Structure 1
């Protein structure tokens, strides 16, 4: 049996864990918390860590542990299951990308259609959308969006984007709050994560849902896709089946378990989501490196400068 450190959604992790158990008969305990805590928790424990597998929602968390020489190398077969143009690769082949969640723009189909949207998420910080576009300045995805713009266009365009949003758009406490707002007819559209919406339409019933998602594509900064992955620790005493778990995670069946409950694009190409998701490669997400401490530091300071925090 193994103990998994999970930074992923408990629902998404639960699915993979139980399906894994049916397929093999191996029990997988779960330790759930944010991707950061677990990574540092694993740093403090070191060679004396209970963690057998680290199921992180973010790649940096995997990186810090890879840079700290704590992760066990995965068989090329495993890391190959989800290989594809734009997918994150472990320099030391010591962790593997599993799923991806994208940035989107949900809008009110009662008022707007596609021809009514922008070709760049950047054009939303203009007078054309004064109080017509919403955002969540305190979201971790909103921070990633800053970090990505800076990396794709430069600091100048990032701060300009932020000041324009503050000047025109409208801030919402959480992502779901920005979606309900669009669904109520309080605001035309809003910048959110595709996952929060799929789960809303499935629960209600798409025919009772007025909101719709828009994807910018074109390697736009608005097409930013964040990846999740999994890794095994060198301190594992069940490395035998810890590997098997990460291998399941990347394998078609494991991909099917997650996508049966989660709306995250499968990196394994032989998998069909139960959610209306186009192949991940079709999103045309821009190429970007992992976010660093100083990078978040930088983006957070830009939020202060924009007057959002």
Structure 2
């Protein structure tokens, strides 16, 4: 019936495809890769691509496929489903945002409480946090964070943050490696994404975990939410059933099914997650424009300037 190109978590995607099929009876086959490569691969088959729907963890990928006249404009009702202040809107109305995932601080509740954390993510790059703040200089989510500080605060502020993390902080190879470092009692705190912790708590049993999360809010760069979205390709030979799916994904049903398996924040406001997430608006994420190639470029330079790459 339909084929979706999936740059999102397979378990997530499958949950949503299964929920869709059950509800309409329409079959869904998934092509799972990193969004970047699926946007790329779509471009090259132009309008003979087998993709009906592009299910992206990355809005920038939705934007390349849009600037390239490859995406089908969606009903207002669909787009309207996840509208909220702060929510990215397609200028052309040819993709829709679905959920977000946030920057957080995980901390060791055996030695730190909320009163101990900082009001700004920028404040961690200092002697006070010497040997007490971990980071993942190699992660994409870290690179997003750098992008957002340059857009919010300018270039020197970003570079200054990174040099102070480099002198004081402690690097880890993976976000999961660092999480386990706080849980293991090796450092007080670490900058990660939220879903790693929720997944871990859900598997272990929260009474058995000694870490908790801090959200900075206050429109701080550290309150950064990264959004996922979806679009239907203008080449689809299944456009009514492809549009149906995207509507599903934006709808109540689609959204509860998502947030049954994944700790992403629903953009649909009627949806309560199975995870202990506040409403996204309460995160008070900063307004930030889409990340471009140049920006990631800019940021990677900054990383190499600070001594990280």
**TM-score, L = length of structure 1:** 1.00
Distance in 1 between the 2:158 and 2:152 partners? 9
Distance in 2 between the 1:107 and 1:179 partners? 9
Q: CA deviation at 1:237?
A: 0.2
Distance in 2 between the 1:218 and 1:300 partners? 27
**Alignment match, 1:232:** 232
Residues 142-179 of structure 1 deviation map (CA, whole Å, 9 limit, x = unaligned): 00000000000000000000000000000000001000
Q: CA deviation at 1:83?
A: 0.2
Distance in 1 between the 2:185 and 2:178 partners? 11
Distance in 2 between the 1:271 and 1:47 partners? 35
Residues 87-114 of structure 1 deviation map (CA, whole Å, 9 limit, x = unaligned): 0000000000000000000000000000
1:241-260 equivalence runs, <5 A: 241-260=241-260
Distance in 2 between the 1:27 and 1:170 partners? 47
Q: CA deviation at 1:184?
A: 0.4
Distance in 2 between the 1:91 and 1:79 partners? 11
Look up the SS of the partner of 2:260 in the other structure: coil
Distance in 2 between the 1:213 and 1:95 partners? 31
Distance in 1 between the 2:57 and 2:25 partners? 25
**Alignment match, 1:193:** 193
Look up the SS of the partner of 1:72 in the other structure: coil
Residues 9-63 of structure 1 deviation map (CA, whole Å, 9 limit, x = unaligned): 0010010000000000011000000010000100000011000000000100000
Distance in 1 between the 2:260 and 2:36 partners? 26
Look up the SS of the partner of 1:268 in the other structure: coil
Distance in 1 between the 2:307 and 2:197 partners? 28
Distance in 2 between the 1:33 and 1:307 partners? 31
Q: CA deviation at 1:208?
A: 0.1
Residues 246-302 of structure 1 deviation map (CA, whole Å, 9 limit, x = unaligned): 000000000000000000000000000000000000000000000000000000000
Look up the SS of the partner of 2:101 in the other structure: strand
The reply on whether 1:306 has 2:299 as its aligned counterpart is no
Q: CA deviation at 1:216?
A: 0.1
Look up the SS of the partner of 1:186 in the other structure: coil
Distance in 1 between the 2:181 and 2:98 partners? 32
**TM-score, L = length of structure 2:** 1.00
Look up the SS of the partner of 1:71 in the other structure: coil
Look up the SS of the partner of 2:99 in the other structure: strand
Count of residues in Structure 1 that have an aligned counterpart in Structure 2: 309
Q: CA deviation at 1:81?
A: 0.3
Distance in 2 between the 1:35 and 1:171 partners? 26
